[model samples]
Target: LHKLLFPDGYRGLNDVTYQVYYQSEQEAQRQLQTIEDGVFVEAEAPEVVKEKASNLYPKNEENAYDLPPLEKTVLDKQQGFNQGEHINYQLTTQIPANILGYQEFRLSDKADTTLTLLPESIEVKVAGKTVTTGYTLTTQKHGFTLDFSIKDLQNFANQTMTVSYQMRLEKTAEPDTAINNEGQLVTDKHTLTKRAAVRTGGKSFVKVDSENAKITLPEAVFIVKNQAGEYLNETGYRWQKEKALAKKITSNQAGEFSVKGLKDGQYFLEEISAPKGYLLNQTEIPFTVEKNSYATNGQRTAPLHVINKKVK
Candidate 1:
């Protein structure tokens, strides 16, 4: 058996090293031989060889928890509102998929100054099913707040949460004005808001002499009634079944009689008593108030010219 010597540990091919030669007779016992490049070494074979392989695979990781937008809508007519009429409002939003993990979740709603919230009319639904418990309602000055239980909303993940309520337009609501309602959805990570608007309308009329249009007539007693046969009240904001409680609409000094905060609908003015020295005319004058009936200045574009004949 022969053995080879290396000054350094095992190195790969192409490594350079010098070897020493020995002379028996010469005083110089050691001499440097030509530098030699390393050659490949034969590796010992194993009794049993094992093969191993590795690969990189792909996977889908989800971390997003985006919630749907909050929305508000008016279920009733959006425009041409009448005072004392109920305006139905609806708020819709989606529950986050991780609602059960949320720490805070609440909904708040506010009615405009011209409106009054009907607390008992508020109802809540989740995933098309009505929910009455697991939430607390807090009444506010002009609005209300509802705080929900995260555990209760767990089953409604990725489903819709709907809240509906009614608000009456105040009798003192401004005429030809827009009434707004606001809704907000509050969560630990986000706060969303939305709004809805409705408007009120009005109508104007003038009493004049049938013979001479220039002659304005005053104190012409009349009563206004809706198509449903209900009489307009003295304030013109309410309808009554009794004629005595109804408004006795009389022409002013300018012969003008106007009613504000009226809804867009068909109405009739019946002359119950005419002006002094004028014959009583029981004729019913028909009129219609529409969304576009008012001008930019909030005044009716055209006034109803009611005519009464003098006693002949």
Candidate 2:
């Protein structure tokens, strides 16, 4: 029934004393009637004070609270992607319980010139709920940064924070080049980073005469299609469902044709027209484009030799 008092601005282990005064109700009544001089007793309680421990504060003791390290991870749906196509990158991090103790909490991502960030596609979620405010997003030429309000983060402490965004592969991206995007979870005391990589490939071929393996044929027309039957566009990048927008792969005077910036997948080249006095072969030439199928110096490492039979 007594409260101990400690010195103001004091902390750590120390001695505290509680001063108390006690007077019986009978003594109070006697004093009110002036029948006899009422007496009061004074007592003191002394105790050894111990510092309270909390998980929210840091200390150097054996069982002191320790801030958990920020864990970050990045992921993409595909191991390979094509130029001009969109790749969704997901970033996830664990929010430390003592997030407020840090002066800065931010997430940053940087992509090389091979990728173009889509600012509007950035989405942030805290503890499974979408968050549209309480944060600042700054976009740069090839990267972006998210600065979260420490006060706002308190509502979702000790939870998972996820950020997702899209980036389009640059049309000038090199074929078979590994495109890396790295993300960082930054705090005043710690910095954690993770990276995600994807690649694009290409293929090249030469049109030749069927009767003579050494005879090169030119002016041959063909069209490229993906496994989903989507036609390649005119720019030799991207695909479309409409065949009218499909690109025509024609052999130059040198009987050479090259397709670059293609993802790893199955593709086909159908001969729509042949060289002068050649048979029209509508057969689809199926080929697989893998990481190793990339072209070098405008040609595949091992180019495909497509032959056309002459009209009898």
Candidate 3:
């Protein structure tokens, strides 16, 4: 990897042709966005948007962390398992060099790990030391990545083929911290706390302004542009960056809120108001989900259909 640093203003990825290669069958495609006037692939590297530096600019700490999209290489969708029980999905993986082994799936935060319908089996291609038992597992539920020991296949290839079946649980409960019905209170206990999934038909969230001492209440919040280069920022939704403001909310429920009419995709709640004694919540942790598209933004995203937050 080569680092190209520019002291003066830099041009975005109008010319840079860096590519992330995947298997031929995967046929993956990614969007392009700018970072610090340089080219960056969507969901590739970390994103760096501008911030309102409190002390001029140089004297301030970097406001936003380098947040890269959590890339999910979908193996297969609409696969089958048990009707009310295990929903299966088959996938091949070429995990980014940046992600580690531990950063696997999460069926639930409180419930150990993501559901593994089939035991993880790896066909070692290194040496003649692994043996495929053809062991079929029928009953197992929880967060686990089963590792298989293969012998005959070891001398076959250089890298082992890993077959891990995930359970696409129909009733995967959304956690409290996730962007769901109950809502998650953003906290610093973890770096990325809230996660939302864009479900079908797109989902939208509402913002609430509280009458607190720290801030005076108001309807309109600050709006800005996403961290794209001047090119896209000139005329696009990337121009709808909202550091001073959040995904604008128009309504609320008793100082709380609700947003509607959104296609399924992940979203994050941008707290429009903060209480007197406390600061803002997880402003950085993005809401994650895939959706058909939505008319609006700024709601929590969740993959699990059911979740129990309120964990200390």
Greater lDDT among 2 and 3 belongs to 2
| lDDT, candidate 2, 261-292, per-residue tens | 78778899988888998999887888777776
- Predict model 3's lDDT versus the native: 0.27
In candidate 2, where is summed lDDT lowest over 10 consecutive residues? Answer: 33-42
List model 1 lDDT by residue over 161-277, tens digit each: 899888888867766666788899998768898988887777778899998878889898888899888888855267889878887878998899876678788888988888999
Please give the distance, in angstroms, between residue 50's alpha carbon in candidate 3 and its true position after superposition: 52
lDDT score, candidate 1: 0.71
After best superposition, candidate 3 residue 81: deviation in angstroms? 15
lDDT of each model, Cα atoms only? 0.71, 0.70, 0.27
Model 3, range 40-93, lDDT digits (tens) per residue?
222333222232112110111112322222222223232211112333332222
The candidate, 1 or 3, that scores higher on TM-score is 1
- C-alpha positional error of residue 185 in candidate 2 after TM-score superposition, expressed in Å: 2.1
Worst 10 residues of 3 by lDDT: 52-61
Of 2 and 3, which scores higher on TM-score?
Answer: 2
TM-score of 3: 0.23
Provide the global lDDT of candidate 2 against the true structure: 0.70
Error of 3 at 265 (Å): 8.7
Q: Provide the TM-score for each candidate, comma-separated.
A: 0.73, 0.75, 0.23
Candidate 2 lands at a TM-score of 0.75
